[PDB]
Symmetry: C4
Subunit: 144 residues, 4 copies
């Protein structure tokens, strides 16, 4: 019921794309914002008073191409950059950089129900997008 | 009633100027913040639980001159600067740059009645302003 | 109604110092945060639903002397820096710079009663202070 | 009720590590967020409507050796940099830098019961951490 508001707000805005089975979640929705970009709305198993907004972004073959070319020095420099940048967007993140080559990066933000609202919901989603966007623009401005 | 509140709040601050027939919007007030600066308050057709605060800006012909003069590299560098700048204002935006010569840039944020208040309506207007204002300062700082 | 609460809270935190006969405001409580620092809480004469957190700061003649000692280009460069800095704080500001020699600077923020609460007020005050402190530290870091 | 809710919330998220006797506080919870990192949720003794979120950090002995070596100028360059950074996270902080050689740093924030809620409380905790994290990351990027 608290989740029907969620389910409803995502459709009122043409966001929601489909629900998804999930062995470790009371529920899970796959939102499309913007365009065909994919963002996840997951309410973890144990907690029923929160929703976690996640966005998984895998660095293309095309891109870790250039990051591989750089010296180990310049890679580190880049992992440090993307790191400071994201720790500025009010989100939590996970970086996947084996040899300091960035394969993927997850941007997350949770909203508890004490403060849930359509306005709040739609904001966090948009913010998580912008957080992961700057990183995508960083790689892009460097490597095209 | 959400509508008369928005309207009275804006009137209460002198932000209001007049309406206008937006054949796409349930309503469309026109604010003037600051002084003679033009900001739009729009409620999309389908949406009856939200207002959009948009502010499109056209860069003067004398400024588009400055940026057109520059090499393509210095231009692409400039567009990246403004993308990275705006993206940290928690606002949506859209740049119109012919051959990377910024023509116009639209900055937009939106409130859902779910969390609409005067304190919030006003703060959102002023934030949309600062975001398009700092982009204006980048242009004026570089081109006079 | 809300005036007695705003007053009650400032005093609860010590913050409050005294009041003063401002002919342009319903009330005007002069706060002291941090210790010895002066911030002003005003409420325009013809405004019920709101207060203003204002912090005026004049640049010592010494510091003003150092920015005097710079070129007219190094001065313009410095003005832009404080402009870009403050516009990222979500506060409004008035800049006083005769010939790009910073005289004083004013940072303000307003709270509309449908958003008022102790938590929020205390925050808006601290944020106004941080916006101010930043420019002051920029000044000192450059000129002792 | 607030202490009770706070205890309850921390435990629901895995944060609440343990409570600890403090003569100068109504209560005092110890948090382990991220997983082995520690934070202090405290209600000042003489405060009936506020909680303090504190994160103390000791500049490791062999990281101050790093900044011991830097010339005074270079050290001061670092103190300003860490001061401008932290003042951007909307947190109160305290720097222990003996000879401009960073000893330890405290990042803090308050939440008045006026605005207390789980969504609010947890965000505060993550913001205090992120700020303290950026300073740590700054030290590590430089000295490893």
């Amino acid at each position: 019921l608290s989740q029907e508001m969620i389910k409803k707000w995502l459709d009122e805005e043409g966001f929601l794309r489909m629900e998804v089975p999930d062995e470790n979640a009371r529920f899970h929705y796959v939102v499309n914002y913007p365009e065909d970009h994919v963002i996840d709305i997951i309410q973890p198993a144990g907690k029923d008073d929160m929703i976690l907004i996640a966005c998984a972004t895998s660095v293309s073959p095309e891109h870790q191409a250039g990051i591989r070319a750089l010296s180990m020095e310049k890679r580190t420099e880049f992992i440090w950059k993307v790191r400071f940048t994201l720790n500025r967007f009010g989100v939590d993140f996970q970086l996947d950089h084996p040899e300091n080559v960035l394969n993927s990066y997850l941007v997350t933000d949770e909203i508890f129900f004490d403060g849930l609202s359509k306005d709040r919901l739609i904001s966090s989603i948009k913010n998580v997008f912008r957080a992961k966007l700057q990183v995508m623009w960083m790689i892009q401005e460097r490597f095209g």
